[PDB]
Amino acid sequence: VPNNEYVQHFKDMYAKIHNANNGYFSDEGIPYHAVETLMVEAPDYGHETTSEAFSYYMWLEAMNAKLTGDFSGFKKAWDVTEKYIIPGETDQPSASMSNYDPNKPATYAAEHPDPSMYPSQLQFGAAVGKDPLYNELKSTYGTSQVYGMHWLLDVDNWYGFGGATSTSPVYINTFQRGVQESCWETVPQPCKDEMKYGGRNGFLDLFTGDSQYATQFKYTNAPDADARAVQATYYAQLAAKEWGVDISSYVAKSTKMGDFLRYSFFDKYFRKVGNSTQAGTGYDSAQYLLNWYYAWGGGISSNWSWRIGSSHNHFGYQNPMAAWILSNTSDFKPKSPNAATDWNNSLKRQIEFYQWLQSAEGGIAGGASNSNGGSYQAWPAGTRTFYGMGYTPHPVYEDPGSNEWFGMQAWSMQRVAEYYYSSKDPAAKSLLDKWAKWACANVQFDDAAKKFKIPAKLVWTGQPDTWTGSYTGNSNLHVKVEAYGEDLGVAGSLSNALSYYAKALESSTDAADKVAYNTAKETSRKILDYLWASYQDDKGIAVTETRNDFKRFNQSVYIPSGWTGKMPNGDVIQSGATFLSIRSKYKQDPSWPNVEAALANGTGVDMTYHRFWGQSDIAIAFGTYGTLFT
Ligand SMILES: OC[C@H]1O[C@@H](O[C@H]2[C@H](O)[C@@H](O)[C@@H](O)O[C@@H]2CO)[C@H](O)[C@@H](O)[C@@H]1O
Ligand SMILES: OC[C@H]1O[C@@H](O[C@H]2[C@H](O)[C@@H](O)[C@H](O)O[C@@H]2CO)[C@H](O)[C@@H](O)[C@@H]1O
Ligand SMILES: OC[C@H]1O[C@@H](O[C@H]2[C@H](O)[C@@H](O)[C@H](O)O[C@@H]2CO)[C@H](O)[C@@H](O)[C@@H]1O
Ligand SMILES: [Ca+2]
Ligand SMILES: [Ca+2]
Numbered sequence: 001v002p003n004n005e006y007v008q009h010f011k012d013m014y015a016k017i018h019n020a021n022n023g024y025f026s027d028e029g030i031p032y033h034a035v036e037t038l039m040v041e042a043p044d045y046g047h048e049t050t051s052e053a054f055s056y057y058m059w060l061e062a063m064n065a066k067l068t069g070d071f072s073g074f075k076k077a078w079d080v081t082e083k084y085i086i087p088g089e090t091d092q093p094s095a096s097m098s099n100y101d102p103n104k105p106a107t108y109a110a111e112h113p114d115p116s117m118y119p120s121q122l123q124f125g126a127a128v129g130k131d132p133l134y135n136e137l138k139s140t141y142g143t144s145q146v147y148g149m150h151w152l153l154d155v156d157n158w159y160g161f162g163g164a165t166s167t168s169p170v171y172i173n174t175f176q177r178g179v180q181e182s183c184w185e186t187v188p189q190p191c192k193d194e195m196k197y198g199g200r201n202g203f204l205d206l207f208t209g210d211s212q213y214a215t216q217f218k219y220t221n222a223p224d225a226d227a228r229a230v231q232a233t234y235y236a237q238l239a240a241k242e243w244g245v246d247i248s249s250y251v252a253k254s255t256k257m258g259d260f261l262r263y264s265f266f267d268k269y270f271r272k273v274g275n276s277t278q279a280g281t282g283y284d285s286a287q288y289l290l291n292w293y294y295a296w297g298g299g300i301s302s303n304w305s306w307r308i309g310s311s312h313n314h315f316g317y318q319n320p321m322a323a324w325i326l327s328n329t330s331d332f333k334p335k336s337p338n339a340a341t342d343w344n345n346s347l348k349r350q351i352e353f354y355q356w357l358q359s360a361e362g363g364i365a366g367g368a369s370n371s372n373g374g375s376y377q378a379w380p381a382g383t384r385t386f387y388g389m390g391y392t393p394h395p396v397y398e399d400p401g402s403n404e405w406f407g408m409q410a411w412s413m414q415r416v417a418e419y420y421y422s423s424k425d426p427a428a429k430s431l432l433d434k435w436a437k438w439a440c441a442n443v444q445f446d447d448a449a450k451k452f453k454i455p456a457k458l459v460w461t462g463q464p465d466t467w468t469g470s471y472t473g474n475s476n477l478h479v480k481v482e483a484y485g486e487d488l489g490v491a492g493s494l495s496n497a498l499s500y501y502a503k504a505l506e507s508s509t510d511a512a513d514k515v516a517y518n519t520a521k522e523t524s525r526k527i528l529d530y531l532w533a534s535y536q537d538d539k540g541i542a543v544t545e546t547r548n549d550f551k552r553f554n555q556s557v558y559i560p561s562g563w564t565g566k567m568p569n570g571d572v573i574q575s576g577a578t579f580l581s582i583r584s585k586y587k588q589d590p591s592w593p594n595v596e597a598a599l600a601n602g603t604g605v606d607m608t609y610h611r612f613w614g615q616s617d618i619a620i621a622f623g624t625y626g627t628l629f630t
Contacts, residue, residue, distance in 0.1 A: 111374025274388015489614020
């Protein structure tokens with residue numbers, strides 16, 4: 001096993017993350033989104049957590065097993081995942097799941113350009129296609145229940161949906177009201193709406209319009225997280241083979257999760273791809289990318305259920321490494337007969353998607369949708385397309401734009417790089433060559449200070465050429481870096497990507513590849529060296545960030561006229577609500593006085609955060625460099 005300073009940096013970070021003093025984990029052994037509680041950005045409280053965090057926990061532990069031969073931590077990560085974030089029997093009652101109708105997967109409702117247009121009316125007469133996965137999955141696993149992670153967990157019952165005296169985890173959701181509903185504009189709701197909290201119909205009639213409402217459950221996948229779980233488990237299995245350890249039952253968990261993850265291939269209402277006013281008859285509604293979500297729900301008081309995909313796709317979610325694992329390794333072939341073939345088709349489609357979205361400069365553009373406006377509107381003449389899906393610079397969300405964050409670049413291209421290293425697929429080479437040149441040109445080193453900045457915010461203009469099968473250079477698609485910053489988690493991910501890219505180039509004898517190898521490897525190493533030299537603190541590796549967006553604690557929340565309800569703690573929900581007015585426990589937070597002062601004299605809020613995923617990306621980047629370059 002490698003024994004160098006980068007391996008040691010991993011072990012030191014690993015020890016920090018697991019030290020009880022540092023507060024990364026709950027009583028249940030669940031990693032929080034961040035150590036710090038006052039935190040709003042996708043989760044809206046720091047001690048919520050995400051399926052993303054669980055997948056990073058798996059990945060962190062896989063790297064530890066690789067370096068130490070100890071797999072106990074990895075097994076633990078999967079055990080807590082299955083117990084707490086994959087809905088169980090009381091969460092998705094089998095009698096409802098078994099009453100699914102794959103010929104009528106769900107009832108159509110439009111998405112809308114503003115939260116004020118919700119609830120959206122259920123349209124029982126509108127077309128919905130056939131679900132071609134259900135019967136195969138049911139036959140394979142002997143149940144109709146779904147084995148996938150729900151995306152958001154209230155780890156210590158901060159919202160109180162679990163009752164006034166519990167700190168056990170509660171499945172919750174936030175985002176419901178379309179493209180303009182930012183994290184500041186949601187109304188948090190329990191995934192199991194038993195109408196005990198909220199209004200007359202619980203929270204249900206904020207979101208969907210119907211003539212009556214019954215108690216029900218709803219879960220929503222984050223496909224990028226479930227794919228990362230597969231990626232992590234493959235790394236653990238490589239380690240298991242090296243160390244002579246059997247983790248086959250954990251491999252089986254990941255492959256089952258990857259089997260259900262095929263729902264992320266499908267249009268929201270199983271509409272034909274590129275002919276989206278029409279109901280699909282099966283795989284003609286397969287987009288074959290990792291979409292923004294699949295979701296499923298059903299009755300509590302009576303037995304019924306539904307499933308949806310998503311028509312929207314973001315490059316930042318894709319994971320060719322996961323797709324390759326599930327389609328081209330024997331260990332991770334899923335049990336459903338068609339799963340490996342489906343994943344092989346997704347692998348090819350994903351790599352095409354990255355190429356299609358690659359800007360003139362090299363950054364990857366947003367994505368594509370099968371549902372213009374989220375209501376299957378006609379595409380404007382001249383719309384640029386990918387297998388019939390229209391280009392979208394900012395998939396799903398525009399407050400802020402979902403492709404403004406540079407982190408998607410690092411996260412997603414890390415997977416392409418690891419995939420290229422593993423498969424040496426020539427279709428990934430020019431894509432990575434071009435992306436890496438752009439990324440490295442935008443890392444700003446201060447060598448005297450041993451510090452750096454990387455892009456924070458990206459601005460997009462133009463559009464790609466319609467995909468005809470090969471990259472065009474996309475001369476009219478552009479990215480500009482609008483701001484630079486010190487997001488250390490993203491920097492860790494970027495190092496990881498550059499490490500795999502360089503290692504993949506190591507066998508090249510081409511002179512230009514050798515130059516690129518040196519540049520990528522040195523850039524990766526310097527990021528790691530400067531992280532270690534200059535950014536360590538007691539809990540991990542971190543730096544202050546200014547959150548000007550925290551002015552939105554007083555953000556108005558849309559509530560329909562005449563609608564009234566209450567949060568579990570009694571906060572009144574009615575027109576005139578704000579982010580803070582329905583989350584009054586924020587004023588009990590130890591960081592609140594600082595926030596309230598800041599709002600008082602019009603400043604951004606300075607915070608130093610230890611995000612679990614960020615600390616994990618940094619640790620894993622150390623371990624990656626230390627293992628690839630011995
Ligand atoms: O939604 C994507 C991820 O966002 C992460 O938060 C980002 C945020 O989007 C940026 O605007 C900026 O503030 O940096 C944050 C930290 O990198 C969030 O932590 C992740 O959980 C999301 O997947
Ligand atoms: O209410 C019964 C009716 O619900 C439909 O499911 C809705 C669900 O009510 C709503 O809360 C959720 O957000 O969307 C789904 C979309 O289907 C279901 O499709 C019907 O079969 C069911 O009878
Ligand atoms: O708005 C579409 C869809 O969003 C779902 O939440 C997403 C969230 O937008 C994303 O930031 C996070 O990483 O993943 C979750 C789960 O996919 C929301 O749960 C859906 O109800 C909503 O329709
Ligand atoms: Ca708890
Ligand atoms: Ca908004």
